[PDB]
Amino acid sequence: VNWSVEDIVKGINSNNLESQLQATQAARKLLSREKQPPIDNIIRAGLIPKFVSFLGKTDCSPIQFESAWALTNIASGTSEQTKAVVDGGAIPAFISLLASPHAHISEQAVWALGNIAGDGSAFRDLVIKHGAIDPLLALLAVPDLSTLACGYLRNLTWTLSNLCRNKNPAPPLDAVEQILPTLVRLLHHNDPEVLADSCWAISYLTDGPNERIEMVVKKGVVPQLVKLLGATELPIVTPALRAIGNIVTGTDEQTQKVIDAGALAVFPSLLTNPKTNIQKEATWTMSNITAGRQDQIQQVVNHGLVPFLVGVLSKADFKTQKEAAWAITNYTSGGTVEQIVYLVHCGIIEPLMNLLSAKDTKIIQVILDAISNIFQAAEKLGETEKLSIMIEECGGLDKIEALQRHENESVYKASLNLIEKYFSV
């Protein structure tokens, strides 16, 4: 074994079918060895078109299988290499094999199409234009998904998820509406990996305009996304939290469906998750919720989440702290006077003042905005003096005075307004 590319070329070109099979096996072994498949050597030998033609040889199903595997591995490389597979006519040929009576050939064609679509929007739309969605969904048309082999079902879920992926442009609306019902079924399956890729698909489809968010929401997936948010497997929580985060960027009505499904009961553990990426994502999601209606801010209060946002603002890494500050600003600009009082009783002032030491200019503006909003609520109550002594007792007044020297302009004018308005006489 360890054939040379020249040996492979020789065997593939013969009129002997048995030597074509052996040569394709050698090519597949050469292309499936862990490190450095010599993909470019294979492309330059001109083998792609011949492999694509073998994909049609329904008689010799072994050479169909070996070709599909070789081409899967070529299509799994760079965009330039995936492009050679596409220019070789491979997409229609793989689509044809989706109907093969041999399950393992059909699976390998699903996998190859996943790699092609995974290259980007352009190749994803090619795959859809050649009509891949119908035969793919027909493979999942069985009433009980547990009858499919676990590996088969996983690859179908992964390839479907790649047809939902990427933007500029987003997938065509026709295709999304065709895929969503099957995606809903997969989201209720039990296999961890199926659930993870289904969540990734939903997170792709909800990454876009509110119109796309409504397509997914109207299918009823939010309660199951929330249940998967409470899972213990991090590869499920990550995409589920990504999807929930996208949905609460939409309207107050779409955000409310996330709250109605109970999402706020899971967020205390997300905001204290040991993985920094989860905390940051969950805090960002909280800032868009606190940007909603006053009654939705109130459900944040009632689920006891304010003390956890204060915790994040106090103890988290700086990038997550930025997100928490945004959630406070949004809270203080949209909240009632009684909600702001409660925010103050939770100890917001000090951790907020402490972040005014941050070099980052954007966050300083966010913080000053929150301070002004709280002062406006304090004016309604006639308690601006009480709030002003509180800011002095946290070390805050010195930091606000120091801001005058700041280079930025909006910071300069903002801090001077606060000092003249509440720290005079």
Binding site: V248, T249, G250, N288, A291, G292, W326, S333
Partner: peptide
């Protein structure tokens, strides 16, 4: 609006 969709661009 008050909601931010572009956390990624915000970076």
């Amino acid at each position: 609006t008050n909601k931010k969709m572009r956390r990624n661009r915000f970076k």
